[PDB]
């Protein structure tokens, strides 16, 4: 499923991402935008045997298991396929866990490059949520 910006904003708010560990809603919306363009089925193969899955492109080397990645750590203890669902529940739970490490949202390079230290509220500014 390809979310509408505001549609996803409301979804992420519903799933408690706004102000989660000091990160306003916009941060997550921005990251979703640059990572997958709000597409839950987005996937990306990497040079190692890993793959990034979902609306937030979570890597199978450390966060999820796809039964076909060498040196998998499966920190989110979740099948990577769960991160491709139209229901963002799984991707959100894993995201919340990733950001709970010492480096927070800095885990997402795209967030640092195009969201970190910017007026992220712009992303939700305009939605009636």
């Amino acid at each position, epitope marked *: 499923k390809v979310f509408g910006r505001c549609e996803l904003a409301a979804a992420m708010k519903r799933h*408690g991402l706004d*102000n989660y560990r000091g990160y306003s809603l916009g941060n997550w919306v921005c990251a979703a935008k640059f990572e997958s363009n709000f597409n839950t089925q987005a996937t990306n193969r990497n040079t190692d045997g890993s793959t990034d899955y979902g609306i937030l492109q979570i890597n199978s080397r*450390w966060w999820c298991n796809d039964g076909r990645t060498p040196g998998s750590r499966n920190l989110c*203890n979740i099948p990577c396929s769960a991160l491709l669902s139209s229901d963002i529940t799984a991707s959100v739970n894993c995201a*919340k*866990k990733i950001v*709970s*490490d*010492g480096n927070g949202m800095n885990a997402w390079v795209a967030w640092r490059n195009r969201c970190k230290g910017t007026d992220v509220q712009a992303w939700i500014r305009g939605c009636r949520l």
Partner: antibody
Amino acid sequence: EVQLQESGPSLVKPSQTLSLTCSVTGDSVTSDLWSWIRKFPGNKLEYMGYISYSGSTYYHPSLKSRISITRDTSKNQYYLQLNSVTTEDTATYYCASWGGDVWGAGTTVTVSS
Amino acid sequence: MDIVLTQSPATLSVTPGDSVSLSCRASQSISNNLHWYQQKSHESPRLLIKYASQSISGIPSRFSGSGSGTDFTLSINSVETEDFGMYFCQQSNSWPYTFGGGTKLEIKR
């Protein structure tokens, strides 16, 4: 199936250091974030802090000064160190996964002279 | 300021077969970042509901959670004999994580 077990001195004297060990079996200590939670008398729970998969940590502010959480990857265990204890540190200590899906049996540590 | 979770009633006596609702209130909005735990005497805490209403595979279906923001509720559809003990809520929205004072589910006679 991942399992946890707390071990360490059951008695610590005032002003000394409290040390506890959590042994991770079934999986690697590097496969999750792990925490230390204590229960004071009167059913009062306190989330002392946690250590990530990377080794970084977060400590409860009320403890940020006396607490330190470390891990040993070759042994699959992580530890809790709490300095300058007083009788108020007497409690049941538990180690658990960050997700709260796994918990040790917990171990009582009493601070007394 | 650390988030304070207030649970009520502190204690609740019911007859097995009856249904009950347990309240947990947060001093600040925490969206859906509220988790429910059960702890029976001499046993370690067990996670029942995560993120306000998400079910945990392996937990009896009589247990369910609802609420959002600052008001949460743990519901037990027809309490069973092995369900008595302590119930605590915990927020993970902000560090430090904090627990509510707990509600004691006891047997009515």
